[PDB]
Paper text:
Here, we present data demonstrating that the leoABC genes, encoded within a pathogenicity island from enterotoxigenic Escherichia coli (ETEC) strain H10407, are dynamin-like proteins. This is important because LeoA has previously been linked with the secretion of heat labile enterotoxin (LT) through membrane vesicle (MV) biogenesis and release from the bacterial cell surface. Bacterial DLPs (BDLPs) share many of the qualities exhibited by eukaryotic DLPs—they polymerise, exhibit GTPase activity and assemble on lipid into filaments.
Monoclinic crystals of the protein in nucleotide-free state were obtained and the structure solved to 2.7 Å. The crystal structure of LeoA reveals a fold with all the hallmarks of a DLP including the key structural GTPase, neck/BSE and trunk/stalk domains. Within the GTPase domain, which is an extended form of the canonical Ras GTPase domain (but smaller than that of BDLP1 by three beta strands), Helix 8 is significantly longer than the equivalent region in human dynamin 1 but similar to that observed in BDLP1. This 90° kink between trunk Helix 13 and neck Helix 12 is mediated by Gly274 (inset) and represents the equivalent of Hinge 1a in BDLP1. After superimposing the GTPase domain of LeoA upon that of BDLP1 (apo and GDP-bound) and human dynamin 1 (apo), the LeoA trunk is observed to be fully extended, pointing in an opposing direction to the nucleotide binding pocket of the GTPase domain, and yields a ‘flattened’ conformation that is more reminiscent of human guanylate-binding protein 1 (hGBP1). Although this contradicts previous findings, it is consistent with the nucleotide-binding pocket of the GTPase domain being occluded in the LeoA crystal structure. Crystal packing analysis did not reveal any obvious physiologically relevant interactions of LeoA monomers with each other.
Numbering used by the authors: 1 to 113, 121 to 571
Write the structure that this text describes.
Amino acid sequence: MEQFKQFSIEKQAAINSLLQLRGMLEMLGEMGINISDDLQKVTSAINAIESDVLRIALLGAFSDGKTSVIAAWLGKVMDDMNISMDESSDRLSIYKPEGLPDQCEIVDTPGLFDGRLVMYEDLTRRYISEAHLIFYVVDATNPLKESHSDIVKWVLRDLNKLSSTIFVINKMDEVTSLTDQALFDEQAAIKKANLKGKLQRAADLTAQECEQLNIVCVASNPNGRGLTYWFTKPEHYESRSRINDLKNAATEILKTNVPEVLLVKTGMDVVKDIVIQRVTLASRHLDELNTFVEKNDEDMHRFSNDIKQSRIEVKRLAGELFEELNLMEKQLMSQLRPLDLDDIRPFMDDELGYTEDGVGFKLHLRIKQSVDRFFEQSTAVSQRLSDDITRQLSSSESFLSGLGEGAFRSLGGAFKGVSKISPATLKTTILAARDTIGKLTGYVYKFKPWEATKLAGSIAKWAGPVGAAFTIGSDLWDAYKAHEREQELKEVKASLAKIIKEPFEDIYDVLSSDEKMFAFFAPQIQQMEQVVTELAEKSQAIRDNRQKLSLIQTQLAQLMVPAT
């Protein structure tokens, strides 16, 4: 991996990253977000970028052997790439060597190496800012000339190119043996430390910036023999010069710094930071929305289950109620059929009730207490149902309240403007459904008056005067013969049966049909079902939106993987 292939590669990566940016923009557009003309702006920056070529700013005094360092690194002696560098001109200058695998620009400011005016020229500042690599070449004996403080500051502080600058301590030969691997590294580390201290102090560097510094020790032209000669021995030279340490450092900077240079140069750094911000934000609040829409969708099914179970339970109670009332009636009837006329009054008193009003009060109260008990158990069922619906609605309200009123504005068009959807629009629909349910829910008291049944005069004479001790007189018993009396018994029993049966008949007709049964003992179950059914319908508009957005975010997440 060498310098022009790395660049060409980093160029392409940056172009790709911008095509993914374009893709990310199309999706925002799709969720009704701005764009203005960011799509065409991005295409333009891709085109501008295609032109660009590798650029190195070669900085340093010429006497520190800068020219050797760059030829060395490229691979070719200066004249073979038909270019020749001028020692003094008070301007910026650019060299575009030839016969190389690809093109590259070599920028420098020869005047500096009141020629210090070029540091404040927007032009020479732009050309060095927009370089991908900066070599500041210094001396091994006494690294960094005494006069250069403000140039180091210009590069590292003013222009802010520390991440892309390699200080190249050159001519290490005249400080150490190029043979003794372990001594070189000892002097190379001491010289790296020394220069580190002069730079930090020339440019106000912090301790952290100091660690970021790129320093490399090298011997471009070792012994003094020359490049033309040393290229003839390419693998001997590399071990001695340590030039590979420089190519490698340069390769890692390119790896990192080439895209930043290209993005900034075209103004796309800013475009891209904003787009990735809106997308990151957009999925973080789609996650919120999904949580709400999922929960709400699951509650709806949960509410219809509750209603089912509710209904199943009430049906079970209605049947138990019926079973209980049917025994009561069978029991009373089997007590009646064997009774002789003396037995009658005790029976009316003790089982039915016998008053001036008439007969039936005692039975009525006992039927009533059985009906009441069901009406209460069944009213409690409907109360447990209201409490679950009401609990879940409230936890949706509470989820949506913690989102913030602007939580969905990043999701674009449907959450902005006069028809906007928001946590508060959705909360409202929920709370009016919870309100309608808090008014349905109710124990009720409805008074149902009861009249007793008067006994026929004919049958009143076998019962006796109300509330008195009564046995049947001789005068009454010997007014009939047996067949005139056992018939008198039959029509009195006929009389009590009709009385006994009546109150059950009515209520069995109610329990025999679920429509009626429900309408009398548990109407709020149907009423709550209505409310739940309506709430379901009002939930469509977000479901429509959440779907579009999810399909959309799936694509965004894809486009965003490279950017992570």
